[PDB]
């Protein structure tokens, strides 16, 4: 299992290593790009040729509040090769920059997208759309308010426009926590859990929608077009799960080449106090679930979480499931099923060392285009002032 050194980065919190960095690492053509905060809090951008281990690294003019692990960096490359990057939010005005030129690590000034509803941003996420355009998703609101906002970047006009103002409706009652993926056919997939009130134990259910027209209209797997916005009552339930089953929020999802969705998360068995890793997927006709490992060690979300929220990639039913577990010494770990429906899941460790509070993020585009799995790997703590730890790209042997 081959580790490619990048550079040392901040490790006192998990800001560089959350599951919801979309993306920390991204390939365009034969170049791979990475982003992180250095030990002084500066946003660093880097790139290499995929056939080299020599990085060009550039400390930008920007800093982030790295003591708040919410305040992540998400990046993406558009069809003309410009880096788009958004960073350093926890209910704050939008921070968004772009490369000054194709493939450049140098950024211009902070810019608006649409200039509307950009005062209270959390969780910036980018996804590439067919033809070179980009999608941007974020949570708008402070003091417990949350709403999913979705924009599109037209490569042609070089501008952002709003796609949905209200896609998921909490009806002034509840919040949602979501994840998305744009499949190899350009379909946008969306899944989420509800959170009924302040407390994490009030998370419940896994819901799903998809769009074939870059976010304008939305469908269920069973073919019905949604009447928007999507509420508790009309949502498609991929998996019905109660409150108080240790169901976690804000994980990740993927799809196979055929456009079938796969969702990776965790929750406990009814007759147990031990959360277990899960996969939920739809085969075109039915939703299924499987438990990935047989953990022994209990924990509860109520009141550092001992396991990481997961990532997955899929190849025609074959699943590679990336996680981290105190039971395995907090190494980077992988579970593999030849066939998601029927195989036993074989577990291996991808690092021989602990990465502690690390969660996985991966080069989504390299998997889609080249079927290679590269992970952003760095030891971090749930913040003790520790020395910055080396960031690697882990090039996975499968
Ligand atoms: Cl190595
Ligand atoms: Cl700054
Ligand atoms: Cl929300
Ligand atoms: Cl994607
Ligand atoms: Cl596939
Ligand atoms: Cl079903
Ligand atoms: Cl088997």
mmCIF file of N, CA and C in Angstrom, residues 326-376:
data_model
loop_
_atom_site.group_PDB
_atom_site.id
_atom_site.type_symbol
_atom_site.label_atom_id
_atom_site.label_comp_id
_atom_site.label_asym_id
_atom_site.label_seq_id
_atom_site.Cartn_x
_atom_site.Cartn_y
_atom_site.Cartn_z
ATOM 1 N N UNK A 326 -11.231 2.579 16.124
ATOM 2 C CA UNK A 326 -10.432 2.335 17.341
ATOM 3 C C UNK A 326 -10.174 0.851 17.611
ATOM 4 N N UNK A 327 -11.129 0.002 17.255
ATOM 5 C CA UNK A 327 -10.942 -1.452 17.383
ATOM 6 C C UNK A 327 -9.784 -1.990 16.566
ATOM 7 N N UNK A 328 -9.418 -1.284 15.491
ATOM 8 C CA UNK A 328 -8.293 -1.667 14.648
ATOM 9 C C UNK A 328 -7.111 -0.719 14.829
ATOM 10 N N UNK A 329 -7.039 -0.038 15.959
ATOM 11 C CA UNK A 329 -5.930 0.887 16.193
ATOM 12 C C UNK A 329 -6.002 2.198 15.428
ATOM 13 N N UNK A 330 -7.204 2.561 14.962
ATOM 14 C CA UNK A 330 -7.419 3.813 14.217
ATOM 15 C C UNK A 330 -6.524 3.926 12.992
ATOM 16 N N UNK A 331 -6.253 2.784 12.359
ATOM 17 C CA UNK A 331 -5.562 2.774 11.077
ATOM 18 C C UNK A 331 -6.545 3.174 9.974
ATOM 19 N N UNK A 332 -6.036 3.448 8.780
ATOM 20 C CA UNK A 332 -6.911 3.534 7.618
ATOM 21 C C UNK A 332 -7.252 2.089 7.326
ATOM 22 N N UNK A 333 -8.536 1.768 7.234
ATOM 23 C CA UNK A 333 -8.941 0.390 6.975
ATOM 24 C C UNK A 333 -9.841 0.315 5.767
ATOM 25 N N UNK A 334 -9.930 -0.886 5.174
ATOM 26 C CA UNK A 334 -10.778 -1.127 4.015
ATOM 27 C C UNK A 334 -11.522 -2.421 4.168
ATOM 28 N N UNK A 335 -12.802 -2.403 3.806
ATOM 29 C CA UNK A 335 -13.586 -3.612 3.664
ATOM 30 C C UNK A 335 -13.986 -3.782 2.199
ATOM 31 N N UNK A 336 -13.897 -5.015 1.716
ATOM 32 C CA UNK A 336 -14.082 -5.331 0.324
ATOM 33 C C UNK A 336 -15.123 -6.429 0.163
ATOM 34 N N UNK A 337 -16.060 -6.236 -0.762
ATOM 35 C CA UNK A 337 -17.039 -7.287 -1.143
ATOM 36 C C UNK A 337 -16.963 -7.444 -2.650
ATOM 37 N N UNK A 338 -16.747 -8.658 -3.129
ATOM 38 C CA UNK A 338 -16.782 -8.894 -4.567
ATOM 39 C C UNK A 338 -18.173 -8.596 -5.153
ATOM 40 N N UNK A 339 -19.179 -8.981 -4.383
ATOM 41 C CA UNK A 339 -20.587 -8.791 -4.712
ATOM 42 C C UNK A 339 -21.272 -8.291 -3.454
ATOM 43 N N UNK A 340 -21.759 -7.066 -3.540
ATOM 44 C CA UNK A 340 -22.343 -6.367 -2.393
ATOM 45 C C UNK A 340 -23.485 -7.142 -1.718
ATOM 46 N N UNK A 341 -24.306 -7.770 -2.549
ATOM 47 C CA UNK A 341 -25.475 -8.510 -2.095
ATOM 48 C C UNK A 341 -25.132 -9.762 -1.297
ATOM 49 N N UNK A 342 -24.080 -10.504 -1.693
ATOM 50 C CA UNK A 342 -23.832 -11.838 -1.107
ATOM 51 C C UNK A 342 -22.466 -12.123 -0.491
ATOM 52 N N UNK A 343 -21.431 -11.372 -0.848
ATOM 53 C CA UNK A 343 -20.110 -11.664 -0.318
ATOM 54 C C UNK A 343 -19.968 -11.367 1.160
ATOM 55 N N UNK A 344 -19.094 -12.127 1.794
ATOM 56 C CA UNK A 344 -18.492 -11.680 3.032
ATOM 57 C C UNK A 344 -17.609 -10.451 2.753
ATOM 58 N N UNK A 345 -17.509 -9.586 3.739
ATOM 59 C CA UNK A 345 -16.680 -8.394 3.624
ATOM 60 C C UNK A 345 -15.326 -8.710 4.234
ATOM 61 N N UNK A 346 -14.250 -8.648 3.444
ATOM 62 C CA UNK A 346 -12.903 -8.892 3.947
ATOM 63 C C UNK A 346 -12.256 -7.561 4.354
ATOM 64 N N UNK A 347 -11.643 -7.540 5.532
ATOM 65 C CA UNK A 347 -11.106 -6.309 6.097
ATOM 66 C C UNK A 347 -9.613 -6.356 6.043
ATOM 67 N N UNK A 348 -9.028 -5.242 5.627
ATOM 68 C CA UNK A 348 -7.590 -5.072 5.660
ATOM 69 C C UNK A 348 -7.280 -3.661 6.183
ATOM 70 N N UNK A 349 -6.050 -3.474 6.642
ATOM 71 C CA UNK A 349 -5.589 -2.158 7.039
ATOM 72 C C UNK A 349 -4.695 -1.623 5.942
ATOM 73 N N UNK A 350 -4.910 -0.377 5.564
ATOM 74 C CA UNK A 350 -4.135 0.262 4.504
ATOM 75 C C UNK A 350 -2.920 1.027 5.057
ATOM 76 N N UNK A 351 -2.933 1.379 6.348
ATOM 77 C CA UNK A 351 -1.772 1.942 7.015
ATOM 78 C C UNK A 351 -1.399 1.069 8.203
ATOM 79 N N UNK A 352 -0.127 1.095 8.566
ATOM 80 C CA UNK A 352 0.318 0.356 9.741
ATOM 81 C C UNK A 352 0.323 1.255 10.973
ATOM 82 N N UNK A 353 0.010 2.530 10.773
ATOM 83 C CA UNK A 353 -0.020 3.539 11.845
ATOM 84 C C UNK A 353 -1.417 4.127 12.041
ATOM 85 N N UNK A 354 -1.655 4.637 13.241
ATOM 86 C CA UNK A 354 -2.915 5.315 13.596
ATOM 87 C C UNK A 354 -2.993 6.681 12.965
ATOM 88 N N UNK A 355 -4.145 7.002 12.416
ATOM 89 C CA UNK A 355 -4.455 8.344 11.929
ATOM 90 C C UNK A 355 -5.475 9.047 12.827
ATOM 91 N N UNK A 356 -5.748 8.423 13.983
ATOM 92 C CA UNK A 356 -6.614 8.929 15.044
ATOM 93 C C UNK A 356 -7.977 9.479 14.567
ATOM 94 N N UNK A 357 -8.139 10.801 14.513
ATOM 95 C CA UNK A 357 -9.464 11.416 14.206
ATOM 96 C C UNK A 357 -9.781 11.529 12.719
ATOM 97 N N UNK A 358 -8.845 11.115 11.884
ATOM 98 C CA UNK A 358 -9.018 11.106 10.433
ATOM 99 C C UNK A 358 -10.335 10.432 10.004
ATOM 100 N N UNK A 359 -10.989 11.069 9.033
ATOM 101 C CA UNK A 359 -11.986 10.436 8.223
ATOM 102 C C UNK A 359 -11.559 10.461 6.766
ATOM 103 N N UNK A 360 -12.045 9.500 5.971
ATOM 104 C CA UNK A 360 -11.650 9.470 4.564
ATOM 105 C C UNK A 360 -12.258 10.520 3.662
ATOM 106 N N UNK A 361 -11.411 11.017 2.750
ATOM 107 C CA UNK A 361 -11.860 11.693 1.536
ATOM 108 C C UNK A 361 -10.966 11.146 0.406
ATOM 109 N N UNK A 362 -11.502 11.101 -0.805
ATOM 110 C CA UNK A 362 -10.814 10.450 -1.930
ATOM 111 C C UNK A 362 -10.985 11.208 -3.234
ATOM 112 N N UNK A 363 -10.177 10.826 -4.212
ATOM 113 C CA UNK A 363 -10.138 11.486 -5.498
ATOM 114 C C UNK A 363 -11.274 10.884 -6.317
ATOM 115 N N UNK A 364 -12.437 11.508 -6.185
ATOM 116 C CA UNK A 364 -13.652 11.017 -6.828
ATOM 117 C C UNK A 364 -13.474 10.877 -8.343
ATOM 118 N N UNK A 365 -12.833 11.860 -8.956
ATOM 119 C CA UNK A 365 -12.675 11.886 -10.408
ATOM 120 C C UNK A 365 -11.700 10.832 -10.945
ATOM 121 N N UNK A 366 -10.630 10.561 -10.215
ATOM 122 C CA UNK A 366 -9.703 9.519 -10.598
ATOM 123 C C UNK A 366 -10.355 8.149 -10.554
ATOM 124 N N UNK A 367 -11.225 7.904 -9.586
ATOM 125 C CA UNK A 367 -11.951 6.650 -9.574
ATOM 126 C C UNK A 367 -12.866 6.564 -10.821
ATOM 127 N N UNK A 368 -13.614 7.630 -11.101
ATOM 128 C CA UNK A 368 -14.531 7.619 -12.221
ATOM 129 C C UNK A 368 -13.838 7.432 -13.568
ATOM 130 N N UNK A 369 -12.705 8.098 -13.759
ATOM 131 C CA UNK A 369 -12.047 8.133 -15.073
ATOM 132 C C UNK A 369 -11.036 7.022 -15.229
ATOM 133 N N UNK A 370 -10.358 6.639 -14.148
ATOM 134 C CA UNK A 370 -9.249 5.690 -14.243
ATOM 135 C C UNK A 370 -9.334 4.438 -13.362
ATOM 136 N N UNK A 371 -10.412 4.304 -12.589
ATOM 137 C CA UNK A 371 -10.576 3.230 -11.616
ATOM 138 C C UNK A 371 -9.372 3.027 -10.709
ATOM 139 N N UNK A 372 -8.819 4.133 -10.237
ATOM 140 C CA UNK A 372 -7.791 4.134 -9.185
ATOM 141 C C UNK A 372 -8.368 4.831 -7.973
ATOM 142 N N UNK A 373 -8.055 4.295 -6.788
ATOM 143 C CA UNK A 373 -8.522 4.857 -5.514
ATOM 144 C C UNK A 373 -7.359 5.486 -4.780
ATOM 145 N N UNK A 374 -7.383 6.801 -4.730
ATOM 146 C CA UNK A 374 -6.386 7.589 -4.018
ATOM 147 C C UNK A 374 -7.097 8.278 -2.885
ATOM 148 N N UNK A 375 -6.526 8.123 -1.699
ATOM 149 C CA UNK A 375 -7.052 8.696 -0.472
ATOM 150 C C UNK A 375 -6.147 9.795 0.072
ATOM 151 N N UNK A 376 -6.791 10.837 0.599
ATOM 152 C CA UNK A 376 -6.160 11.870 1.417
ATOM 153 C C UNK A 376 -5.960 11.297 2.820
#
